[PDB]
Design a protein around this ligand. Structure first.
Ligand SMILES: NC(=O)c1ccc[n+]([C@@H]2O[C@H](COP(=O)([O-])OP(=O)(O)OC[C@H]3O[C@@H](n4cnc5c(N)ncnc54)[C@H](OP(=O)(O)O)[C@@H]3O)[C@@H](O)[C@H]2O)c1
Ligand SMILES: NC(=O)c1ccc[n+]([C@@H]2O[C@H](COP(=O)([O-])OP(=O)(O)OC[C@H]3O[C@@H](n4cnc5c(N)ncnc54)[C@H](OP(=O)(O)O)[C@@H]3O)[C@@H](O)[C@H]2O)c1
Ligand SMILES: O=c1oc2cc(O)ccc2c2oc3cc(O)ccc3c12
Ligand SMILES: O=c1oc2cc(O)ccc2c2oc3cc(O)ccc3c12
Lengths: 260, 261
């Protein structure tokens, strides 16, 4: 046995075909876990994440499921178990970002965001509890903007992750009857497609800076003068879902390099 | 003739104000001098009583029916409030439902039942308030002590529903600043209403085997003050937040539990 390792464990990561999810999947594979890789759209990217987990000497499978659909989350979890035999770790990572002044937010934009970020995560957790083995791990995904960072025109997304914060604290109470811990990672600005999507909204007059200048300014948010990377979030998920991480339970961990 | 804390000339709207916390708020704002729009979805008779209560103490009020789950009915409610009284200054989002269940048992339908009102509803109330309200207005949403300060088994859905409200109001205050509107939430603990008696047993270790009175007595011991929370206690705080003097409290969630936390 090796401390911090996941030899003989089976894990599932939602939206692990790219971004943070991809780094989490690969890292769980590096730690010894067999991995179910979930995507909605990024097939080739998911097959590529599968390849890397195998390349490290583990096993992985790619399963297409749209996390907005609860019948699909159920089917995803059923198929995970039927393939690997059991499931120990579930990481809810899939999410979308949004910007808009309160006055312009539509019914459709609200639903687009909450169906995935909140409702989706809520039922990934449900299916995880239902399918997991005794002593398992569930990790959901929040945001530094949930509680720790206040950005104009960012109310919908912030709120969607605020629910997740309350969710995991109470989930830990219910999930304890199967000795399962429930936590959330709350990343700050982490360099992925999402970062490039909305970095201009996190900076005063963001439009008047290049993409690279915005990345450099984001790097100075942290007193460590660097950006957050998907590996940083992976590193923490790795510890949370290890035997050693058990006493962290029902907590939300903000991962912004000390920006807050 | 300006008295600090009063709301003469002001027009207020409280969702779900036919009964419960919202009725006390609506009545209270009326006592402070505001003209009030009393909202209901089902309690017609009780809404009429609130209207009458507000008229008997020297103010004016109207009862408007609107399901707060329906966004086009929120739009209409706000359109009618401004239409009837001339302008709108204060909006209190109060309408909510409680829910209990172990995570493993929570259905899509129950999820949607709770979130469409407690969260989505409150979100779009806030939106219609910003669109209709006057410069220097006030917006109060309703969170809960369970969102963040109190942790109860089998209570994840409801807790999260209000945890969303907590982040909403903080950011709302940023957007709403350009109309000089303040946005806050009140997060009550155990407050004696229909909702309270309906679920007090889910908050106490096998509260099934205590009476309804006994459970209220036990909730009273949560506060170091040794009494329950009442709708008037929330009304008292909302009353300050929406006054002139409460302006510097902005983008905040005020837990109102008599110091239980
Ligand atoms: N990046 C940041 O700075 C940052 C900061 C705070 C919080 N977060 C949170 O971190 C999580 C991941 O963010 P990211 O940076 O990896 O974003 P990203 O690079 O845009 O990736 C989003 C991921 O979500 C998946 N996804 C989207 N819709 C889905 C659906 N309907 N069903 C299943 N999966 C779906 C995507 O998969 P497909 O491409 O296959 O659709 C993709 O794998 C999100 O919850 C985000 O809110 C990110
Ligand atoms: N009581 C507590 O200990 C406590 C604690 C924490 C938070 N809260 C929150 O405080 C708020 C009020 O609580 P309460 O104790 O007064 O609840 P309550 O006694 O059950 O009253 C519910 C109120 O919401 C209205 N309502 C319900 N569904 C509605 C809808 N679809 N559209 C518009 N209005 C609707 C009801 O009016 P109709 O009868 O006409 O439907 C009624 O006026 C809620 O947000 C609740 O979550 C209460
Ligand atoms: O904290 C953040 O959270 C984010 C979350 C996202 O999903 C995307 C981008 C960011 C992001 O860009 C920034 C730029 C800055 O100069 C300072 C902070 C941030 C910041
Ligand atoms: O904090 C509370 O919030 C509530 C909210 C409701 O809607 C109904 C009941 C309660 C309630 O009952 C209790 C009994 C106790 O012994 C201690 C705390 C509470 C408590």
């Amino acid at each position: 046995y090796i401390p911090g390792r996941l030899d003989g464990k089976v894990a599932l990561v939602t939206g692990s075909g790219r971004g943070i999810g991809a780094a989490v999947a690969v890292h769980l594979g590096r730690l010894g876990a067999k991995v179910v890789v979930n995507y909605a759209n990024s097939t080739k990217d998911a097959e590529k994440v599968v390849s890397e987990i195998k390349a490290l000497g583990s096993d992985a499978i790619a399963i297409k499921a749209d996390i907005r659909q609860v019948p699909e989350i159920v089917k995803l979890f059923d198929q995970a178990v039927a393939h690997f035999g059991h499931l120990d770790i579930a990481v809810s990572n899939s999410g979308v970002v949004s910007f808009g002044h309160l006055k312009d937010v539509t019914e459709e934009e609200f639903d687009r965001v909450f169906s995935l970020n909140t409702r989706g995560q809520f039922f990934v957790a449900r299916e995880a509890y239902r399918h997991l083995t005794e002593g398992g791990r569930i990790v959901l995904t929040s945001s530094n903007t949930s509680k720790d960072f206040s950005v104009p025109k960012h109310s919908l997304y912030s709120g969607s992750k605020g629910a997740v914060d309350s969710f995991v604290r109470i989930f830990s109470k219910d999930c304890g009857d199967k000795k399962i811990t429930v936590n959330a990672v709350a990343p700050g600005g982490t360099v992925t497609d999402m970062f490039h999507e909305v970095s201009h909204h996190y900076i005063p007059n963001g439009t008047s800076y290049t993409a690279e200048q915005r990345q450099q300014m984001a790097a100075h948010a942290s007193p460590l003068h660097r950006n957050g990377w998907p590996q940083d979030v992976a590193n923490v998920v790795g510890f949370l879902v290890s035997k050693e991480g058990e006493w962290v339970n029902g907590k939300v961990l903000t991962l912004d390099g000390g920006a807050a």
